[PDB]
């Protein structure tokens, strides 16, 4: 494939787009790179994640503002104004669903599929992504549609977890990131704070015990995520 | 989708930080062909200021890179950055042609003789957006837009010194942006500083004329004119 399109120019464009803070361009470049069907370098894997996290993140942020407005607005009872806002919230939802769908397709049909059992970190990374984006779908879903995304997020986090227990140090940033977000899933989506705290604590303690397993490359990222785990732990606890 | 709904959407869009939506909403309001209220006019200005501003920011970062990497000298990496810059440029110029068009065909054309605040506001906008064009243009292209920016700034200047008070925020803002045109675009620091100081000192002279409604707007701009003079003189 790469014989047809220059793969390295595409990644360069993505780096470029990141610096101009043009994240649609960035995701577009990384989608294309993925589609060449080669496996993704650790950097490329980050570029991909950052691009889509900012593209979906912008919609999330706008949705939360518009949702909050709908609650106050409804309170008034002004028909026309409420419908304005609900319509607008829906426009943003549909952009959000479309970005999640783009990511999930990429994950299932390119990223997850391609990597080996031996490549263990890639598998957890992408499986966590799949968890996150079903979680993003879950945040704006209702009724049946919601249960299905929640279950899907669950399934994807649950498998990401099993693979990390068995094959990753409790201090690995990815295994730590996974524990973070999975706990967030339990608190925010499942409204199950008992599980949330348990998972966030279990992960934090296990990390602390093995504090020897940190290298010069890990200590920055492992400890920063261990703090977040704790920050959520403290909070939810109160 | 009547006029009051459009403005409601512009407001929502702003909360959402969705500035293209907000620009599109106020563009539809402008095209209803009636004058804009002060609220509406600020909504319009804010929308397009963020829309174009996102591009201006991008372009600078990309432009900065072109210079630094032209050194490394790879002739296909140089070519790509140049392309990316040009992609951004054409978006930015398109936003500016769009605003300018609203200005010449609707907003400016629709002022009555006695709507001086409005004219100074719209001529300063016209001034601003030809300036945005000048930041990315070169050669005769630059000369042409720089001339246009000047021509608009200058007419706003004269209407404002005859019909508005030194403490008026639209007049003060004109001075600040116009002083910037002199500094950044025409590269005339002396003529910049004179314009910034005169507007500041004139405002101080008549500080008593600040009304309760806009003293916050006027005072912040006065703060900026100073920050500018400090920076520009200090070098």
């Amino acid at each position: 494939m790469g014989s047809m399109v220059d793969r390295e120019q595409l990644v360069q464009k993505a780096r470029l787009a990141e610096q101009a803070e043009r994240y649609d361009d960035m995701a577009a470049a990384m989608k294309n790179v993925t589609e060449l069907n080669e496996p993704l370098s650790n950097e490329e894997r980050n570029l991909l994640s950052v691009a889509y996290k900012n593209v979906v993140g912008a919609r999330r942020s706008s949705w939360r503002v518009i949702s909050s407005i709908e609650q106050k607005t409804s309170a008034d009872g002004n028909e026309k104004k409420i419908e304005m806002v609900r319509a607008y919230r829906e426009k943003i939802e549909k952009e959000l669903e479309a970005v999640c769908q783009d990511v999930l397709s990429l994950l299932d049909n390119y990223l997850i599929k391609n990597c080996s059992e031996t490549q263990y970190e890639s598998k957890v990374f992408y499986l966590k992504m799949k968890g996150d984006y079903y979680r993003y779908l879950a945040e704006v879903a209702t009724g049946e549609k919601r249960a299905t995304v929640v279950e899907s997020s669950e399934k994807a986090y649950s498998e990401a977890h099993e693979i990390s227990k068995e094959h990753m140090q409790p201090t690995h940033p990815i295994r730590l990131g996974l524990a973070l977000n999975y706990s967030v899933f339990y608190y925010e989506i499942q409204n199950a704070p008992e599980q949330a705290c348990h998972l966030a604590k279990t992960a934090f303690d296990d990390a602390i015990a093995e504090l020897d397993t940190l290298n010069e490359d890990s200590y920055k990222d492992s400890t920063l995520i261990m703090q977040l785990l704790r920050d959520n732990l403290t909070l939810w606890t109160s | 989708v009547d006029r009051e709904q459009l403005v409601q959407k512009a407001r929502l869009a702003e909360q959402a930080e969705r500035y293209d939506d907000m620009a599109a909403a106020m563009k539809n309001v402008t095209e209803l062909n009636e004058p804009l209220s002060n609220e509406e006019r600020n909504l319009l200005s804010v929308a397009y200021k963020n829309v174009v501003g996102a591009r201006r920011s991008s372009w600078r970062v990309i432009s900065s890179i072109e210079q630094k990497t032209s050194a490394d000298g790879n002739e296909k990496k140089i070519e790509m950055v140049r392309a990316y810059r040009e992609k951004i440029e054409k978006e930015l110029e398109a936003v500016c042609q769009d605003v300018l068009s609203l200005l010449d065909n609707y907003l400016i054309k629709n002022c009555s003789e006695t709507q001086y605040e409005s004219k100074v506001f719209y001529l300063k906008m016209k001034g601003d957006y030809y300036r945005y064009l000048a930041e990315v243009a070169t050669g005769e292209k630059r000369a042409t837009v720089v001339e246009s920016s000047e021509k608009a700034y200058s007419e706003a200047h004269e209407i404002s010194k005859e019909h508005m008070q030194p403490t008026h925020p639209i007049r003060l803002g004109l001075a600040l942006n116009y002083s910037v045109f002199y500094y950044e675009i025409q590269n005339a620091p002396e003529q910049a500083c004179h314009l910034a100081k005169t507007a500041f000192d004139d405002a101080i002279a008549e500080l008593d004329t600040l009304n309760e409604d806009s003293y916050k707007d006027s005072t912040l701009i006065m703060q900026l004119l100073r920050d500018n003079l400090t920076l520009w003189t200090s070098d």
Partner: peptide, 11 residues
């Protein structure tokens, strides 16, 4: 220059 003008993992 001036002219008038509960977390999850982070990128």
């Amino acid at each position: 220059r001036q002219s008038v003008l509960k977390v999850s993992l982070a990128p």
